[PDB]
Design a binder for this molecule. Structure first.
Ligand SMILES: *[C@@H]1O[C@H](CO)[C@@H](O)[C@H](O)[C@H]1NC(C)=O
Lengths: 52, 52
């Protein structure tokens, strides 16, 4: 006879997990692209320095 | 709703149970004519009218 509390607890527990999963995947897929662009920029700076 | 006044015990819990129900089968748990030999089963009230 406390089904509403059980559903509220399930709603809280299943709502936090989605947010944390989404945040983790966004963090990984943004930092990977930033790392790759940073490497390409560093190679370009060495080429410009040797040319100059 | 409740045509006769009174309190419906655990009404919201009944709503929460009936939310996830696909179907029902209405069956006669106690027959009116045979399961009460020594009582009067005829009872009417003016708080619940049907066709005047
Ligand atoms: C009803 O009354 C009759 C007549 O006396 C009796 O035999 C019977 O035990 C009573 N109860 C039921 C449940 O029929």
């Amino acid at each position: 006879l406390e089904k509403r509390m059980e559903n509220l607890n399930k709603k809280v527990d299943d709502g936090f997990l989605d947010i944390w999963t989404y945040n983790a995947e966004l963090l990984v897929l943004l930092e990977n692209e930033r790392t790759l662009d940073f490497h390409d920029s560093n190679v370009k700076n060495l080429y410009e320095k040797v040319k100059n | 709703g409740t045509c006769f006044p009174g309190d419906f015990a655990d009404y919201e819990e009944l709503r929460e149970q009936l939310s996830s129900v696909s179907s029902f089968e209405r069956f006669e748990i106690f027959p009116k004519e045979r399961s009460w030999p020594n009582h009067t089963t005829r009872g009417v009230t003016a708080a619940c009218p049907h066709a005047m």
